[PDB]
């Protein structure tokens, strides 16, 4: 979607593996704020917005 019409996806109840994405050179930018980018798989939250 366009940046002004940014799309939002809701993520409830699904396991995800942020290690295969952090280890990928395809992503030109991977920067995290408030949570360490390395320690990401351990964290648990009730909902995720994308």
């Amino acid at each position: 979607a366009s940046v002004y019409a940014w799309n939002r996806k809701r993520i409830s109840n699904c396991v995800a593996d942020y290690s295969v994405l952090y280890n990928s050179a395809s992503f030109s930018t991977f920067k995290c704020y408030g949570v360490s980018p390395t320690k990401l798989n351990d964290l648990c939250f009730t909902n995720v917005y994308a």
């Binding site: 809701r10 409830s12 109840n13 909902n47």
Partner: peptide, 20 residues
């Protein structure tokens, strides 16, 4: 707005809601 979706004489059921 959907936040969950699951798919799987006398009958008795007990419905309760405790600690979320």
């Amino acid at each position: 707005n959907c936040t969950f979706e699951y798919v799987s004489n006398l009958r008795e059921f007990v419905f309760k809601n405790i600690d979320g």
